[PDB]
């Protein structure tokens, strides 16, 4: 539960760091954002579940 | 090895952060050094 | 303080506030890269 929580919360940070540097260069070079429109979509969708994970999971640790 | 190769905009943002770092070290030194008050 | 669990992020949260400033800054990294057009 706890480590399970620190995992979700900690991974959620690295995804953000990655997501943040990503989306930019994404819409940036139109070398796609069609193939990456797939990547970004998964990052975005993923992110939300994660927040919801840490959200609900918070009430069990603290 | 001359002629611009190291893109300028990078020489700057690098030499730039480099100054905020040293000048920032000074600001930290203000709450620890001898110039402290503690 | 930060709820017991998140404590591991204490340090992280210590720098978050300053980020906004960075953006005003970046806009300059950019223009420099794009040769002040």
């Amino acid at each position: 539960m706890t480590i399970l929580f620190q995992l979700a919360l900690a991974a959620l940070v690295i995804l953000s760091f990655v997501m943040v540097i990503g989306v930019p260069v994404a819409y940036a070079s139109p070398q796609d954002w069609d193939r990456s429109k797939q990547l970004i979509f998964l990052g975005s969708g993923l992110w939300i579940a994660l927040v919801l994970v840490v959200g609900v999971l918070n009430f069990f640790v603290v | 090895s001359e002629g611009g190769r190291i893109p300028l905009w990078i020489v700057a943002t690098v030499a730039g952060m480099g100054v905020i770092v040293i000048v920032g070290l000074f600001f930290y030194g203000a709450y620890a050094g001898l110039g402290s008050s503690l | 303080k930060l709820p017991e669990a998140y404590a591991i992020f204490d340090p992280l949260v210590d720098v978050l506030p300053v980020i906004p400033v960075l953006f005003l800054a970046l806009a300059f990294v950019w223009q420099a890269a794009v040769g002040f057009r």
């Binding site: - | 990078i10 | 992280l12 990294v29």
Partner: peptide
């Protein structure tokens, strides 16, 4: 103790997201 580790990365991050663009040359 030394969360300067943090700053450092999120710091070279800003310039990175434009540099990679200088490489993939496009949209700056």
């Amino acid at each position: 103790i030394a969360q300067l580790t943090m700053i450092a990365m999120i710091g070279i991050a800003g310039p990175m997201i434009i540099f990679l663009l200088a490489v993939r040359r496009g949209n700056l």
